[PDB]
Design a protein around this ligand. Structure first.
Ligand SMILES: Nc1ncnc2c1ncn2[C@H]1C[C@H](O)[C@@H](COP(=O)(O)OP(=O)(O)OP(=O)(O)O)O1
Ligand SMILES: [Mg+2]
Ligand SMILES: [Mn+2]
Length: 538
DNA sequence: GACCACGGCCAC
DNA sequence: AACTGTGGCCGTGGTC
């Protein structure tokens, strides 16, 4: 293009280069803008941010987050990544999008600015006539990008000293287990190396191998294999406890305290908006969507996520969300009635599994019932179900048989979804979000049936993800007017931060917004809690 | 140092 | 192990 002087006219597309992927930690190396067949390159990128009224272009949110870090309100606008993502959610990176729609993603701000301009023109053209995708763009994704930027720049408070203390405690317990594993094995080795562990269990000891690994065909040492050997030899039990502790220490307890930001004093994740095949968000650097919650030690870790002094955390989580979505998408009269009566299938399955009254279902039990209910739903095999529940094969077929005959319209919707996917090549959510699934007519059975399971899962998971995104878009401005903050999204859950004297009002309002976001044929029910820490608030 | 594949495992 | 699905991060082992 023709090189013009900074600043650019209003409505220009931005290009920028960061020292590293994380916007809260990145040095803004370069900044440029393109419009009207010209390119503007900024002499000093930080100063030049003040001139922009809007971040418009590829990865707009990332630049908006960095502007918020500097005390500038530079909201993100159009982003060709979002247009490409709605056209085909396999469009996840600028490298691919550029190569697919008319450019090349380089490492220079000016070229990235001119690329953003061209890619928006072409992609906006590809979307002419796709009115449902355009609705999702204007009413969900583009406004959501602004919400995410604020969430990323706000961060979450963490009890650092608490986790440091915990690390030393967990370390001592790890050494006790390690020392005994070595004693039973008769010698020491790297207990973290699954290759070395394989030899010990299956060659040195006489333990039988139950399964092989996918890519390399080694004898597996996964938890499911060890649980099957848990009493065939004691050492296994110690290995399972070792694995749990080292997993939590190396993934959460030790890395997280070192990631507190110096200006904010808080922990900052990234909410990736074009990263999944179903329309879900993802979280990275660090992932705050997989913080432990299941085991007693996991809960000690979750307690480290706390509220600023004078504030409280508010946590909202949809009830049995993808089951309610299934009722609406399938139109099953039997299943609709289950939620109109305020029933809970996870609690029911839990009582069934454990042979105890519903009043005796602890959280750990209901947690296991969810894997069953969603495993069966999305196609688990009878044999595996028998092994997961330690019951004969015949009883497992019957559970799967009962499960689906209770709701006949479900398998009819599954088959309808698959037929539509084979005709058009894609499946879609309630709002029209698409996932292309071409393997539905593959001649290899395993490849075909895998595609099938991915195919009819996406409309359910994706619709639930659509609803949450829409709720976040509606809820955010209401929270600003109350002086509250939106902190995290965990697929079907939101964590907020609110002043203590407005905490109760915020919880009531957020609950209502999330439940009436988009009424379905079944009521959406939301559980909400308030506490000084993330665990207390659920 | 920077990559990567792999097996494994945390959450939804 | 795997006819549940969606993610991201770990250490190991390897290459460059
Ligand atoms: N094991 C799994 N397999 C497949 N999908 C899953 C699995 N676990 C969770 N999901 C999906 C379906 C859930 O509706 C959705 C949100 O998870 P989650 O909130 O834990 O469960 P839930 O909303 O069904 O129950 P709850 O009433 O406890 O909130 O994620
Ligand atoms: Mg949840
Ligand atoms: Mn839920």
């Amino acid at each position: 293009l023709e090189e013009a002087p900074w600043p650019p006219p209003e409505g220009a597309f931005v290009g920028f280069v960061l020292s590293r992927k994380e916007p809260m930690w990145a040095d803004l190396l370069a900044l440029a803008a393109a419009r009207g067949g010209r390119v503007h390159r900024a002499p000093e990128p930080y100063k030049a941010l003040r001139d922009l009224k809007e971040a418009r272009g590829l990865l707009a949110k990332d630049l908006s987050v960095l502007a918020l870090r500097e005390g500038l309100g530079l909201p993100p606008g159009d982003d060709p990544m979002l247009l490409a993502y709605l056209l085909d959610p396999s469009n996840t990176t600028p490298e691919g999008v550029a190569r697919r729609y008319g450019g090349e993603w380089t490492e220079e701000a000016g070229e990235r600015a001119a690329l953003s301009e061209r890619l928006f023109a072409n992609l906006w053209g590809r979307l002419e006539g796709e009115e449902r995708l355009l609705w999702l763009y204007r009413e969900v994704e583009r406004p959501l990008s602004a919400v995410l930027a604020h969430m990323e720049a706000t961060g979450v408070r963490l009890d650092v000293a608490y986790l440091r203390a915990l690390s030393l405690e967990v370390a001592e317990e790890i050494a006790r287990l390690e020392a005994e594993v070595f004693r039973l094995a008769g010698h020491p080795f790297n207990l973290n190396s699954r290759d070395q562990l394989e030899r010990v269990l299956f060659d040195e000891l006489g333990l039988p191998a139950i399964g092989k690994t996918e890519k390399t065909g080694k004898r597996s040492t996964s938890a499911a294999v060890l649980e099957a050997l848990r009493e065939a030899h004691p050492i296994v039990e110690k290995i399972l406890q070792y694995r749990e502790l080292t997993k939590l220490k190396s993934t959460y307890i030790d890395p997280l305290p070192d990631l507190i930001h110096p200006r904010t004093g808080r922990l900052h994740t990234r909410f990736n908006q074009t990263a999944t095949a179903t329309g879900r968000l993802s979280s990275s650097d660090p992932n705050l969507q997989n913080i432990p919650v299941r085991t007693p030690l996991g809960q000690r870790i979750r307690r480290a996520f706390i509220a600023e002094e004078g504030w409280l955390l508010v946590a909202l989580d949809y009830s049995q969300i993808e089951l309610r979505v299934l009722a609406h998408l399938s139109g099953d009269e039997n299943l609709i009635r289950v939620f109109q009566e305020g029933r809970d299938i996870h609690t029911e399955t839990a009582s069934w599994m454990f042979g105890v009254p519903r009043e005796a279902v602890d959280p750990l039990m209901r947690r296991a019932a969810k894997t069953i209910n969603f495993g069966v739903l999305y196609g688990m095999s009878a044999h595996r179900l028998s092994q997961e529940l330690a019951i004969p094969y015949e009883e497992a077929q019957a559970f799967i048989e009962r499960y689906f005959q209770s709701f006949p319209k479900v398998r009819a919707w599954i088959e309808k979804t698959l037929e539509e996917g084979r005709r058009r090549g894609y499946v879609e959510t309630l709002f029209g979000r698409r996932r292309y699934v071409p393997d539905l007519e593959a001649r290899v059975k395993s490849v075909r049936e895998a595609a099938e399971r991915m195919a009819f899962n996406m409309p359910v998971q994706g619709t639930a993800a659509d609803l949450m995104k829409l709720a976040m878009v509606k809820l955010f401005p209401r929270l600003e007017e109350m002086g509250a903050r939106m902190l995290l999204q965990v697929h079907d859950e939101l964590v907020l931060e609110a002043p203590k004297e407005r905490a109760e009002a915020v919880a009531r309002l957020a609950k209502e917004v999330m439940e009436g976001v988009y009424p379905l044929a079944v009521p959406l029910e939301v559980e909400v809690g308030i506490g000084e820490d993330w665990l207390s608030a659920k």
